[PDB]
Design a protein around this ligand. Structure first.
Ligand code: 71H
Ligand code: CL
Ligand code: CL
Length: 370
């Protein structure tokens, strides 16, 4: 269902939580793998994520059990806990999920990046923007595996502006903290994974190309990309996938020195949002924008592959365009942009035309009038 990566490398996957608290880092790692004979990765790994999704969709908790029945055994094509492919320093992408999502729902992107030689750290935010997430109250709880769950916060109309901005700021701090953790692991720092999994983090020592770091994200995660870039210069460039610009404070628009690429869906965008994207532009800064023809907001997330065409188009999970075609365009254009602004010595420049929207299923810039 969820597509395999298009690159030459097999892909592995694991989870890392450090420290064990609600202030620690929680991420799902996708990486180039040595082996390809392991069990596939469980897509949504706990029942509480389904209860969280039901609250996010506005239905009763019992609908969560129905979602669990339909999707609870589904996997994604990544070798769970497989050894890292040795003998090469890989560039790093930190990925930020949308409102109501969590770390595991962008594996199509994560797996494809990893298949082309990236390590991808998909963060799980503890700002109450995730449908659900978990942590451990103290050291004892972590030992026995007694999880404390944190669910999505519903906002009153009056809370919107202030709380969304507090959330995007926390999200940015979580992205920076995840980077610092991965870089420390790269420089041999011993870390006790709060989750007891058969993947030794010592394998990641000397595995990261420390200057080739990017941040990518969808919707609320797209705003997170921009906030993160403005406050952490260790990130060399960013790619915002159908960014939702509402959470950003007025101050961030003029302080994004890094190259920034907006990849939009045809049907999600609107003038107020496009105007905010245009405020990030300046003659001295590198900016690109493309729109995928026939695509919808959900083409960037994994649920676009989870159902058939009829049920998909009804639930707003698919657009007029084929989902595999849409994600290939976003992923290939992303690789070209990454090679250019991280200075990679790969063949991703074969997709440079996609950065300019030069393709039958792409629109240069945007279809929205402002
Ligand atoms: C309807 C409730 N309503 C108010 C909260 C709107 C909810 N909504 C549209 C939805 C996602 C939808 C969805 C999922 C999952 C099934 C399922 F049944 F297949 F599981 C069906 C139908 C429900 C389409 C969005 O919020 C869209 N959105 C997203 S969606 C990110 C996401 C979340 C969960 C996922 F499973 C996959 C992807 N991330 C953002 O950062 C922003 C926005 C809007 C502005 C900022
Ligand atoms: Cl849409
Ligand atoms: Cl508008």
């Amino acid at each position: 269902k969820i597509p395999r990566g298009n690159g030459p490398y097999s892909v592995g996957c694991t989870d890392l939580m450090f420290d064990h608290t609600n202030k620690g880092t929680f991420l799902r790692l996708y990486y180039p793998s040595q082996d390809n004979d392991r069990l596939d990765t469980l897509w949504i790994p706990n029942k509480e994520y389904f209860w969280g999704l039901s609250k996010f969709l506005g239905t009763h908790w019992l609908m969560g059990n129905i979602l669990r029945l339909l999707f609870g055994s589904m996997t994604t094509p990544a070798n769970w806990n497989s050894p890292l492919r040795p003998g090469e320093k890989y560039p790093l992408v930190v990925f930020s999920h949308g409102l109501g999502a969590f770390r595991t729902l962008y594996s199509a992107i994560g797996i494809d990046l990893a298949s082309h030689g990236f390590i991808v750290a998909a963060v799980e935010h503890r700002d109450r923007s995730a449908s659900a997430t978990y942590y451990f109250k103290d050291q004892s709880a972590a030992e026995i595996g007694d999880k404390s769950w944190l669910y999505l916060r519903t906002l009153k109309q009056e809370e919107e502006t202030h709380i969304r901005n507090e959330q995007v700021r926390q999200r940015a701090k979580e992205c920076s903290q995840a980077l610092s953790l991965i870089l420390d692991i790269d420089h041999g720092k011993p870390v006790k994974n709060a989750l007891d999994l058969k993947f030794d983090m010592e394998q990641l020592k000397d595995s990261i190309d420390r200057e080739k770091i990017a941040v990518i994200g969808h919707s609320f995660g797209g705003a997170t990309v921009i906030q993160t870039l403005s406050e952490d210069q260790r990130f060399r460039c960013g790619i915002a996938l159908d960014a939702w610009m509402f959470p950003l404070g007025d101050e961030v628009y003029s302080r994004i020195p890094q190259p920034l690429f907006f990849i939009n869906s045809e049907y999600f965008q609107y003038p107020a949002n496009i105007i905010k994207m245009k405020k990030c532009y300046s003659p001295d800064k590198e900016r690109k924008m493309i729109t995928i023809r026939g695509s919808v907001h959900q083409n960037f997330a994994d649920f676009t592959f989870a159902t058939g065409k009829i049920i998909g188009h009804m639930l707003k999970l698919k657009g007029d365009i084929d989902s595999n075609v849409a994600i290939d365009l976003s992923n290939k254009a992303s690789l070209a942009f990454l090679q250019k602004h991280l200075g990679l010595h790969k063949d991703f420049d074969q997709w440079d035309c996609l950065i300019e929207g030069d393709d039958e299923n792409l629109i240069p810039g945007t279809n929205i009038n402002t």
